[PDB]
Amino acid sequence: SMSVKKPKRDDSKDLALCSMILTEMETHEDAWPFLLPVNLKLVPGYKKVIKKPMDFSTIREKLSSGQYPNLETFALDVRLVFDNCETFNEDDSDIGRAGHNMRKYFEKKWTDTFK
Ligand SMILES: Oc1ccnc2ccccc12
């Protein structure tokens, strides 16, 4: 509360570390469904069903332009990519399995890096 501060976790390397994690996700062989925005003009249903589209290139642009106020807002967008994927794809489909794999990949990097 006012004039009562909790000890400050060092966040000086957060930007660099999130960038490294994102690079690792960008270069994963199962990242191909998530590299660019889904084409809303070519994929029936996507625009109406998925209220907040998100993809790696969009996360990269936001990270590079100071649009994440902290590391948790970055993690929220990454998870949104995989949440959208689960909403729109069957678990037993190529894209569906890719999403599950990528989420697992991300969360271990996240824990190992920050927890
Ligand atoms: O859910 C998806 C993620 C990435 N690409 C997609 C392409 C077509 C239909 C769904 C997709």
Swiss-Prot record:
Name of the molecule in the record: Bromodomain adjacent to zinc finger domain protein 2B
Full-length numbering of the shown residues: 2054 to 2166 of 2168
Tissue: Expressed at varying levels in several tissues, whereas a smaller transcript was expressed specifically in testis.
Domain Bromo: 9-113
Intracellular or extracellular location(s): Nucleus
Taxonomy, superkingdom: Eukaryota
Family in the record: Belongs to the WAL family.
Quaternary assembly: Component of the BRF-1 ISWI chromatin remodeling complex, at least composed of SMARCA1 and BAZ2B, which regulates the spacing of histone octamers on the DNA template to facilitate access to DNA. Within the BRF-1 ISWI chromatin remodeling complex interacts with SMARCA1; the interaction is direct. Component of the BRF-5 ISWI chromatin remodeling complex, at least composed of SMARCA5/SNF2H and BAZ2B, which regulates the spacing of histone octamers on the DNA template to facilitate access to DNA.
Record function comment: Regulatory subunit of the ATP-dependent BRF-1 and BRF-5 ISWI chromatin remodeling complexes, which form ordered nucleosome arrays on chromatin and facilitate access to DNA during DNA-templated processes such as DNA replication, transcription, and repair. Both complexes regulate the spacing of nucleosomes along the chromatin and have the ability to slide mononucleosomes to the center of a DNA template. The BRF-1 ISWI chromatin remodeling complex has a lower ATP hydrolysis rate than the BRF-5 ISWI chromatin remodeling complex.
